[PDB]
Design a protein around this ligand. Structure first.
Ligand SMILES: *[C@@H]1O[C@H](CO)[C@@H](O[C@@H]2O[C@H](CO)[C@@H](O)[C@H](O)[C@H]2NC(C)=O)[C@H](O)[C@H]1NC(C)=O
Ligand SMILES: *[C@@H]1O[C@H](CO)[C@@H](O[C@@H]2O[C@H](CO)[C@@H](O)[C@H](O)[C@H]2NC(C)=O)[C@H](O)[C@H]1NC(C)=O
Ligand SMILES: *[C@@H]1O[C@H](CO)[C@@H](O[C@@H]2O[C@H](CO)[C@@H](O)[C@H](O)[C@H]2NC(C)=O)[C@H](O)[C@H]1NC(C)=O
Ligand SMILES: *[C@@H]1O[C@H](CO)[C@@H](O[C@@H]2O[C@H](CO)[C@@H](O)[C@H](O)[C@H]2NC(C)=O)[C@H](O)[C@H]1NC(C)=O
Ligand SMILES: *[C@@H]1O[C@H](CO)[C@@H](O[C@@H]2O[C@H](CO)[C@@H](O)[C@H](O)[C@H]2NC(C)=O)[C@H](O)[C@H]1NC(C)=O
Ligand SMILES: *[C@@H]1O[C@H](CO)[C@@H](O[C@@H]2O[C@H](CO)[C@@H](O)[C@H](O)[C@H]2NC(C)=O)[C@H](O)[C@H]1NC(C)=O
Ligand SMILES: *[C@@H]1O[C@H](CO)[C@@H](O[C@@H]2O[C@H](CO)[C@@H](O)[C@H](O)[C@H]2NC(C)=O)[C@H](O)[C@H]1NC(C)=O
Lengths: 99, 49, 268, 49, 49
């Protein structure tokens, strides 16, 4: 888990091979690509309360808001089972309205 | 002979309500070579000197 | 030898002590260049920060570069640079100039402000700074819930800490101990090496011209042999000390590279 | 004061009784000529790889 | 296809081989004496010198 110790990217596994006076590693790594743009917001105001995402991030494609994992674009609709509530939303700077 | 260029200069399109999420991946295999040993050597005084 | 003929002739028959003597120093210099390259050249592009800056309240003016200054160095770098300070020996300039080092650091710092840690794996991904801090609280146990409800207080604490470290560096000296010690050690080694050229080493004088001018070669050669042995001993000791110190510096540089890789480009 | 170098003009001032100066590690750095009593300077003519 | 990929191990081997070779070549140095071989100097002198 320590960054850049073995492999540029996210490490997956490795293989050792011998060499006349040393060793050779073949670091297998995962690297993301083909990025895109979206519009974000740190919380969601519903009935005054401020829902936050359990794991992921809020995004929007112009009309609809989605919650996705942070390393691969995969949008899921927003439901009360992947968000948790904390107080009411007037002290948070960046709230947006939604359902 | 010329002056070194540290790399291509780009400006990341920072804002305060915009993010970028990857949509595809690749898997890369890269090598790395490390010595672990050196040849063992012994020397006899009387023979050499 | 100090540009003399018979001295060179006498030193010639000693075999090749000096080829590896120069080889070691050349290897050391290449090692320093590699050290700097591996410590700083962690990025592929050169990033820049936007002119308009709204980082949720955090204030980076003390560490971000300012175009007004000719060196394009930030305030803290100015404080650090202000606080701290030929007989056949030569000093060579570093391959990278301080301007390029400052550019590397500025690119790193702008990337970590605007992109996060994602720029260490692939291509930099923009992320608003506030909702990046919520990703760093989540990695130490505290939920993100806290940060969005204490944003202003957190920003004020961070700014106050920045000002406090600014003043602590500015007024109180003797904080940059290690670098000063390294510089003083190198200077002391060079100076004590230089001063050895005024020693008899058991001979009649420390100047070649006088000993060759009031004698004849039959025993002037013996005196020159004594001088050569002494100077060779001193030079060999100096080279060995340099090698040991270079090993220590390389260990420190490897530690610094690991710290930059693991704490700057990610949360430890 | 035998030695090789390049002699230039300087600006420092000797007290009326010195003969020559030095800076550190005991290396001659300036000489007063015994004829016009002016302060000269000494620089080693360049060398390098 | 691409060469010079295994740089570090080759450098280590070359360093060791060069060290051994330069150690061997030191046997041909007079070190200020009259010869680099013992047999002739023993055979054309007396024990004193
Ligand atoms: C996301 O949007 C931003 C802004 O719209 C893009 O950044 C600009 O893209 C245009 C392309 O027409 C360039 O001409 C500009 O130079 C870019 N801005 C800067 C500051 O360089 C960005 O490219 C978009 N992201 C993706 C993945 O397309
Ligand atoms: C943003 O994404 C949403 C969800 O994918 C889109 O909404 C649907 O889009 C499809 C076509 O892509 C339509 O057939 C549906 O009627 C839309 N609504 C629903 C409820 O499914 C929306 O079009 C996307 N907008 C943009 C600008 O990309
Ligand atoms: C993101 O930045 C924009 C522009 O810097 C902010 O928009 C401003 O919002 C304030 C009140 O919130 C308005 O008075 C300004 O007129 C807006 N500026 C413009 C150019 O329209 C926005 O508030 C920022 N959002 C966050 C969460 O920081
Ligand atoms: C989001 O929705 C809330 C609640 O509907 C809005 O807050 C109300 O706005 C109206 C009109 O500005 C006021 O008369 C009310 O007093 C507000 N509060 C309540 C409890 O109704 C809010 O303006 C909407 N937009 C944003 C950006 O928050
Ligand atoms: C993600 O990238 C991969 C390649 O890295 C894409 O796979 C290629 O897709 C094209 C068109 O479908 C094929 O002609 C190629 O043969 C595929 N490559 C391989 C190695 O199989 C993949 O389509 C991309 N994913 C998306 C959603 O665009
Ligand atoms: C970030 O901190 C700096 C340092 O205090 C602020 O610069 C000060 O600005 C005030 C008013 O503009 C001046 O009176 C001070 O003299 C400035 N300090 C220095 C050292 O010049 C800067 O304003 C802060 N950032 C923001 C956005 O306010
Ligand atoms: C020794 O050096 C010269 C030799 O004549 C003299 O000093 C100069 O004398 C000339 C004419 O004889 C004058 O024009 C110069 O102004 C003199 N210069 C100096 C510095 O004296 C003098 O005989 C002796 N000078 C000294 C300093 O001992």
């Amino acid at each position: 888990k320590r960054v850049d110790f073995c492999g540029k990217g996210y490490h997956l596994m490795s293989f050792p091979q011998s060499a006349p006076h040393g060793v050779v590693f073949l670091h297998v790594t995962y690297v993301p690509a083909q990025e895109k743009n979206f519009t974000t917001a740190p919380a969601i105001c519903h009935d005054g309360k401020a829902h936050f995402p359990r794991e992921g991030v809020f995004v929007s494609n112009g009309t609809h808001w989605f919650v996705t994992q942070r390393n691969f674009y995969e949008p899921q609709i927003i439901t009360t089972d992947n968000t948790f509530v904390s107080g009411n939303c007037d002290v948070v700077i960046g709230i947006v309205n939604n359902t | 002979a010329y002056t070194m260029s540290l790399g291509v200069e780009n400006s990341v399109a920072y804002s305060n309500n915009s993010i970028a999420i990857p949509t595809n991946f690749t898997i890369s295999v890269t090598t790395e070579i490390l010595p672990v040993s050196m040849t063992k050597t012994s020397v006899d005084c009387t023979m050499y000197i | 030898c100090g540009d003399s003929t018979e001295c060179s002739n006498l030193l010639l028959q000693y075999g090749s002590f000096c080829t590896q003597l120069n080889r070691a120093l050349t290897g050391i210099a290449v090692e320093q260049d590699k050290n700097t390259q591996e410590v700083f050249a962690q990025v592929k592009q050169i990033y820049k920060t936007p002119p308009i800056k709204d980082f949720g309240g955090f204030n980076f003016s003390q560490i971000l570069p300012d175009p007004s200054k000719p060196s394009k160095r930030s305030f803290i770098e100015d404080l650090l640079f202000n606080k701290v300070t030929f007989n056949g020996l030569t000093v060579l300039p570093p391959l990278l100039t301080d301007e390029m080092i400052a550019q590397y650091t500025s690119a790193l710092l702008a990337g970590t402000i605007t992109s996060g840690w994602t720029f260490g794996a692939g291509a930099a991904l923009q992320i608003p700074f506030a909702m990046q801090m919520a990703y760093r609280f989540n990695g130490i146990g505290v939920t993100q819930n806290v940060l969005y409800e204490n944003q202003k207080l957190i920003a004020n604490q961070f700014n106050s800490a920045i000002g406090k470290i600014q003043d602590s560096l500015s007024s109180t000296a003797s904080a940059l101990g290690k670098l000063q010690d390294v510089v003083n050690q190198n200077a002391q080694a060079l100076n004590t090496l230089v001063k050895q050229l005024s020693s008899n080493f058991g001979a009649i004088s420390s100047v070649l011209n006088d000993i060759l001018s009031r004698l004849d070669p039959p025993e002037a050669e013996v005196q020159i042999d004594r001088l050569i042995t002494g100077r060779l001993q001193s030079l060999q000791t100096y080279v060995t000390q340099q090698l040991i110190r270079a090993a220590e510096i390389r260990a420190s540089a490897n530690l610094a590279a690991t710290k930059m890789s693991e704490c700057v480009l990610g949360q430890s | 004061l035998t030695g090789t170098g390049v002699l230039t003009e300087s600006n420092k001032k000797f007290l009326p009784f010195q003969q020559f100066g030095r800076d550190i590690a005991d290396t001659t750095d300036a000489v007063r000529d015994p004829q016009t009593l002016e302060i000269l300077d000494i620089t080693p003519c360049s060398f390098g790889g």
